[PDB]
């Protein structure tokens, strides 16, 4: 098939790849010049002992570090249980006390240091969250007036195991798929379809012949959860035979039979081994999730399904998506699991409503006041709405005093500080109610036990990308039937629930569209379009889609890539073009990274990329500390723009030694910072392959802004006296309020986002020269237009 043309290309891909890397190391052995009595010798032998000694000091203390850690790492899982004897027992006493002695005989020296810099030193003329416990002993000091059972665990595991909606459905489903290679398996959450199924497969030996069993998930954290769960079931260590591989974190060994991953992870395994010949089975979970990676894997694995009939295709999901599922997949049989723990009474408003956020408020008010025990889940659209919500709720709490009971309002969304995410996971303080205000982040993968009420105002904030304008707008959107059903289904998992729809049966049954548009239509796909072009294709049109994009969307993609220089004038791959597809993240960024090669601003452009990878959550902007926050922000504000702002911010953080309290003092989201650092480090781990020399701009931000241009020339606007307006389409934009240039308002502007919130917007913007534009893109940007 086109599959075979692909793997043709891809095996030749691996051949040419290995040979290329080998050629390059030969090149470097060429470039690199191997230029390699009595008292001279007896001189430097003391100096070779100098270095032997000192490198040995670090080396010996390093080996001490190794076995040091190893003693306790070893006594973690052997001693505290078993009936063990004299030898290793005595040596546990030994290694216990002995690593104590090491820590102690070093803590002595550090004690000397700090005690002897405690002291008084005449000045010399030369030209963690406890500001509310350091103000709670101010008061108590101002107010002082003095003058076997592991087998038992296994029993419990199996005993719960047996009660799944799949444990009695065990055998016949096994025999069924033994018949059919492609078996669609419809079942809702809690059935265990993600957990019990791969076990069944393994105990049935599909791992024999050394084979593996893949489980893909759309979310890292969900994969980690799943893997922990099934490794506990299987009674082994997570990582050796049951393992998960996600970006930045391998948790597998060559004992791994049961390997969990992401959809992009599996696509990238096709960047390793087109056949998956070590995998006997791929089980794709929750495919309904509608990601670009799901919709690529569908095609690729369907190819493999026709090409590899000894291979096994399992695709499980939550909802009615089996119609199109089977139909695209040659109408595979559909095994139905019935799985739904407890019931929901789903209510509708009497009528349609005008003020649905307030309606949220007054609803939970009534519910809390009247209802029996039980936790509440409420949806909003997102951040600003949601804090306004807790505003209103806690204000009415203030007014209603002891007339009511303790209402643990907790907001939760994606960018809010991670301690504040975790805070909802604590068991509720007896007698009080806990209400979680949430976004559709709480649709999926977050498991909050205790929630017995669920309120849906029936909406969502969906992105919508029109390509005719290049505009993606995160705007309000009445949420689908599948949405409302699943938002409701979030409930019940331990008891009878309720689901209050802020809209009637009429609007529900009548004007409810089934599914969110399968992602590939609505999204922008520059990295992804390019990825499929460089992954076994030329004709990008008759390709085996599930849902193709509009030819419009594809045409825009092609023009994007050509103009940027990834495409020839006929649409195939340049050296610049390939290098970017292999490079992780999109091209515009990729073009900028290549531009660092020309501009000798390698490190700085690297760190910038690392920032734009995650930005959306950098700076925490609380209402209760607005001014000090704006301040720890306004500190770094550099001349040139937000990108070099980010550059210095990261620079200063790592400067502090990757300090968390640093960002805590300086109002920065530690999550964003450290994941960005990781993406830059693995970028550097790509950097050798993409042939980048590690260079500094030596403080010359001109190179920086110019590499930014050489990447993002497309993303530019100019001054018009009727506002800031595009360079090309002359459609009218506005600057984000929180821009480091927001009041600077430059004449020649570069951005990184293009949205239209309440008005058209652009994010991560910088001031440029129109001259660099004739430096870089005289074929795309001509002078007369500037």
């Amino acid at each position: 098939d086109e599959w075979e043309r692909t793997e043709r290309e891809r095996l030749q891909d691996l051949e040419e790849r290995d040979a290329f890397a080998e050629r390059v190391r030969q090149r470097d052995k060429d470039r690199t010049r191997n230029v390699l009595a009595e008292e001279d010798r007896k001189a430097m032998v003391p100096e070779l002992r100098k270095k032997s000694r000192r490198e040995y000091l670090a080396k010996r203390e390093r080996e001490k570090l190794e076995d040091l850690e190893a003693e306790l790492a070893d006594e973690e899982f052997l001693f505290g249980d078993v009936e063990l004897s004299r030898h290793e027992r005595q040596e546990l006493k030994y290694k216990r006390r002995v690593r104590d002695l090491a820590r102690e005989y070093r803590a002595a020296g550090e004690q000397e240091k700090l005690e002897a810099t405690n002291r008084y030193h005449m000045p010399k003329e030369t030209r963690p969250g406890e500001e509310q416990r350091r103000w709670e002993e101010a008061r108590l000091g101002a107010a002082s007036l003095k003058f076997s059972t592991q087998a038992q665990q296994k029993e419990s595991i199996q005993a719960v195991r047996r009660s799944l909606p799949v444990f009695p459905f065990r055998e016949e489903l096994l025999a069924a798929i033994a018949n059919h290679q492609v078996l669609i398996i419809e079942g809702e959450t809690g059935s265990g379809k993600t957990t019990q199924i791969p076990q069944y497969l393994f105990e049935e030996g599909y791992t024999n012949k050394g084979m593996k069993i893949a489980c893909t998930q759309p979310r890292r954290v969900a994969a980690m959860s799943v893997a922990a769960r099934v490794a506990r079931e299987m009674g082994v260590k997570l990582g050796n035979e049951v393992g998960y591989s996600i970006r930045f974190e391998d948790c597998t060994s060559e004992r791994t039979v049961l390997r969990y991953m992401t959809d992009g992870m599996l696509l990238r395994e096709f960047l390793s081994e087109p056949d998956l010949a070590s995998y006997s089975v791929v089980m794709v979970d929750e495919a309904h999730e509608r990601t670009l990676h799901t919709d690529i894997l569908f095609g690729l694995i369907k190819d493999v399904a026709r090409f590899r009939p000894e291979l096994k295709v399992l695709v499980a999901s939550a909802t009615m998506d089996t119609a199109r599922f089977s139909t695209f997949f040659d109408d595979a049989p559909v095994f139905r699991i019935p799985g739904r723990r407890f019931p929901v009474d789903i209510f509708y408003t009497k009528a349609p409503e005008a003020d649905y956020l307030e309606a949220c408020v007054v609803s939970v008010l009534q519910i809390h006041v009247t209802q029996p025990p039980g936790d509440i889940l409420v949806f909003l659209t997102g951040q600003e709405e949601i804090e306004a919500a807790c505003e209103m709720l806690q204000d009415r709490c203030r007014r209603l005093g002891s007339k009511i009971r303790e209402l643990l309002v907790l907001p939760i969304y994606a960018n809010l500080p991670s301690d504040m995410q975790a805070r909802i996971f604590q068991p509720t303080p007896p007698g009080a109610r806990k209400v979680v205000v949430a976004t559709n982040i709480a649709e999926t993968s977050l498991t909050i036990e205790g929630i017995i009420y669920v309120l849906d105002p029936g909406f969502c904030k969906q992105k919508s990308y029109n390509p005719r304008t290049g505009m993606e707008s995160l705007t309000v959107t009445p949420c689908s039937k599948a949405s409302a059903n699943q938002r409701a289904g979030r409930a019940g998992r331990v008891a009878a629930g309720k689901c209050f729809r802020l809209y009637t049966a009429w609007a529900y049954q009548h004007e409810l569209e089934e599914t969110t548009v399968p992602e590939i239509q609505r999204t922008s796909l520059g990295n992804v379009v390019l990825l499929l072009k460089s992954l076994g294709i030329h004709d990008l049109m008759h390709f085996d889609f599930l849902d193709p994009p509009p030819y419009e969307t594809l045409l825009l993609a092609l023009e994007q890539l050509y103009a940027l220089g990834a495409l020839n004038h006929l649409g195939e791959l340049t050296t610049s073009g390939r290098k970017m597809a292999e490079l992780p993240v999109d091209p515009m960024l990729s073009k900028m990274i290549l531009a660092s090669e020309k501009y000798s601003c390698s490190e700085e452009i690297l760190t910038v990329a690392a920032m734009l990878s995650v930005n959306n959550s950098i700076f925490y902007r609380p209402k209760d500390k607005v001014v000090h926050a704006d301040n720890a922000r306004v500190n770094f504000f550099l001349p040139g723009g937000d990108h070099l702002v980010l550059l210095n911010v990261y620079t200063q953080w790592a400067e502090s030694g990757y300090s968390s309290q640093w960002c805590y003092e300086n109002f920065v989201q530690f999550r964003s910072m450290r994941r960005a650092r990781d993406v830059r480090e693995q970028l550097e781990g790509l950097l050798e392959r993409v042939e980048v020399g590690l260079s500094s701009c030596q403080g010359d931000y001109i190179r920086v802004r110019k590499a930014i241009t050489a990447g993002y020339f497309y993303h530019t606007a100019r001054l018009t006296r009727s506002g800031y307006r595009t360079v090309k389409q002359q459609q009218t934009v506005f600057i984000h309020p929180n821009s480091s240039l927001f009041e600077q308002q430059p004449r020649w502007l570069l951005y990184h986002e293009l949205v239209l919130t309440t008005k058209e917007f652009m994010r991560q913007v910088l001031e440029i020269e129109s001259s660099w534009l004739l430096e870089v893109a005289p074929h795309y940007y001509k002078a007369k237009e500037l």
């Binding site: 500001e131 509310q132 350091r134 103000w135 008061r139 107010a143 002891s402 303790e406 303080p429």
Partner: protein, 112 residues
Amino acid sequence: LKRQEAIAQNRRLTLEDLEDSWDRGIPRINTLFQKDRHTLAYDKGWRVRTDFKQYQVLKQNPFWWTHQRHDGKLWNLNNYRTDMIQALGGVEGILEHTLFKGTYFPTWEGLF
């Protein structure tokens, strides 16, 4: 003590532990919980500083010795008003002395 036990039994100190002693104490226990504890843990030397304001402002403070945000609020004379009315006679005895009945307002609860 209750704070220790709230750490040991790890409970949350609830309103029932502190509604009894809610304006008692010297700072005042209801200063523990005010809005701006966070930026008032940074105001040190406030007592000397209000003493010395007398050389900077041309007016004379009668509460130089204290601070309402920091020391609490240390007197409550809300019943003075109530007993003043009952001793003068009650609102009816009190408004037989005034022009109230010549306004033809129907009752005195609304007066503003």
